Design a protein around this ligand. Sequence first.
Ligand SMILES: CC(C)(C)OC(=O)N1CC[C@](C)(N2CCc3c(-c4cnc(N)nc4)nc(N4CCOCC4)nc32)C1
Length: 875
Amino acid sequence: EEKILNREIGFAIGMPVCEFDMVKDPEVQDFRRNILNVCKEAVDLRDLNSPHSRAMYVYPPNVESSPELPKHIYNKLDKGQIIVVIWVIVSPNNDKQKYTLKINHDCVPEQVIAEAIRKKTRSQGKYILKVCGCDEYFLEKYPLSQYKYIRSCIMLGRMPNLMLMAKESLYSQLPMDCFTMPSYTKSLWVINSALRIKILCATYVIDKIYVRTGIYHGGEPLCDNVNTQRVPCSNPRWNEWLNYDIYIPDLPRAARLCLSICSVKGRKEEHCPLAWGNINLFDYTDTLVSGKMALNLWPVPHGLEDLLNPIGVTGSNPNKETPCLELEFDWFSSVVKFPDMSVIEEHANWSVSREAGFSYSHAGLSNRLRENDKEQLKAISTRDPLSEITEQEKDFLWSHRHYCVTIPEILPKLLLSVKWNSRDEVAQMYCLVKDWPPIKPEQAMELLDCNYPDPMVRGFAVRCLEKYLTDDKLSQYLIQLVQVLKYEQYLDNLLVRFLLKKALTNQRIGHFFFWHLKSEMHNKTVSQRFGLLLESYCRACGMYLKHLNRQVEAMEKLINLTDILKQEKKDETQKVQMKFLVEQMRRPDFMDALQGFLSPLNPAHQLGNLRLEECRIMSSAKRPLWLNWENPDIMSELLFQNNEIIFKNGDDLRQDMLTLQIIRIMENIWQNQGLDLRMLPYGCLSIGDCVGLIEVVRNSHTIMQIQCKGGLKGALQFNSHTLHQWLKDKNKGEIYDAAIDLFTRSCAGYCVATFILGIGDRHNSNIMVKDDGQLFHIDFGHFLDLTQDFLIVISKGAQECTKTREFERFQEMCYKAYLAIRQHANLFINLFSMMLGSGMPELQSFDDIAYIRKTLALDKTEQEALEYFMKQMND
Ligand SMILES: CC(C)(C)OC(=O)N1CC[C@](C)(N2CCc3c(-c4cnc(N)nc4)nc(N4CCOCC4)nc32)C1
């Protein structure tokens, strides 16, 4: 009953559910109970129009956000019409019969079905369309071309193959979801005292040692940092009150105490942080902290480059056998609470009245209290998220804060201009935020990074997402939204409720939401937040938990298998290693585990029997596994008969994930702007700590393999004409011009992309080509830091390739692609900035992201940046 569900949830998270019941923290227990309304709401949405609504949850329509087709996509159609193949399975022999239609691109699925019934009968509401080869359905009345599969077929010039299926055949396979509810003052503003914190002593701990402290709002100090006196190592007792230059009523809601135990060496003094810890000055119930408190510290993360870690996670280290700092806060003879919104609202009105009479009767000059000014506000509004905003500009923005509500896009600049250590300014900012006009999701996401910790600011950003973020765009930005959950002060927040609700009403989002959280469960700084979020997801996702457990079981077996191969049988032959794999595959636990589950790279792909004869232990770095499964779909032949995936144990696949996501976003920018630059963002998913899956691109070869004619030629005898000749043999005739054009467009896209992103390495073994001419890159080891062979293909064989008309057309493609991404720089700056909490070695500070500002030449004019890019291309 509930014991079965708790066992399944425990296996999915990799933690028994009873371990959450043992947690004494009232915030943990309140999260577990209070989040359940999000679960109830999602389940009710799924039962509204059951079984159609249940079918839409399990198989959501995979559509683009807009039915409007870019002019170059509409041109690929035949006078606005598409040719589709509709297949029917005629029982008993289960024969596949096809019916070819020529219909308007914007025909809804029921119109297509009716037209297929007409063509079939020439020799209605009881049927649905499915994509041949995978579990993707057309259950909603969107125009056919808006479905990503159809849109993808229009571009690429492939013919859509759809399968007609009885509506009842699908609805009968949807089991009944069993969501069951589980078994489980004074005001801050009347305290007229300055903030002081006592550092008592440290347990579980170079010349001397001290405690470095600071009051922060985000990564910004609200006052000067204050240190304790230096003491010899030993078990240091300080018993020292640290006094801060800030008054208790001026503490913002998101104010934090950031601590460090620092080391001093005498040589120039060398200071090093030994351990760190951050504390929210207010708890989840708005209570100001008081009395004695002990904090277990965390190890210093690699690449800290400062004595404190204000961006770091909040709360005590769960491992209690670590450096433990004892602190004491003042007790104001009562439980002190942050004021209600109505109290803050009254003070904001009284502040606007006081700071108006102060303007008239104040003898001094107050920089914080015309058409040239409106143009200066408009120019500041257009600066990128990493551009510096001076103290004079902050005074300018804050003084015109009411004019700012008319350029809603300026909100991030204005929020940075507020004096967060002044309750008079903050109360006024809350009122402006409360009625601020909504902004576009790509702009609201900026307000969810580490720079904006305020709950009202973050609440506004989430409300913009609830109103304007489509499920397509939510899927596209999922990795960032799951990462910014780490910046939230508390377990229960508006962002977590938005993401969970979305995950629980769209199973495609729920699948990736599960894996982005599960993959970080090894990280103790997020284990509890992500584990509690995972329990609430698993409790309400329905039958999909049974499928997720099968994916988890396959991945655990592959980690175990690859662990034995990398450790115990490392130097044994690939034949002897494959004999071990075939022996492990004869064991029932492994036979079940590595077969008959959905692909974690794309749950629409079923993975049937493991085809060991087509598998191999690769000789590449970290010895990955090349795996091959049968696609058990009734029409697998129309998509792919076998699914090939690389399972790698040892590489941090997060940088590859991020690069592949960015390439996808760049391609959408280009496609929407009428720039057909074909990219290949293949699937890559981090499954855990340096473990993951990579999608194998069918019909691909490295430049190295093409160049050495499969072993005959050696590097010393490498002709720069070989690549072009190989492409001509693979595409003879009219299909040759298409291959050269596809090669040109894809090569242009990758030249610009790798340039802007600063992708290193780049050689004949990490650059690949498909039979049809499509060029792509693999293995993006690092980021934020065009051979003669390609020019010969682009110029169709000419020796003076940099002088042909084809090279001028390729150059224009690159310039337009570069300018299109420069126009969307804030989005890319924001996507990188939101990842600053992952702990990726090549993305640790805003200085790393500033590399994009240089390649995009954001401090120049449009014509000055194009000339910079032309100089880089010519060099
Ligand atoms: C049979 C073909 C010609 C396809 O492959 C071959 O013969 N190769 C011989 C070795 C080879 C280069 N290996 C080595 C590493 C590798 C990776 C890879 C590995 N680690 C990260 N982090 N990221 C990507 N990815 C792919 N890709 C296959 C194509 O689809 C995209 C993914 N191949 C790879 C493939």
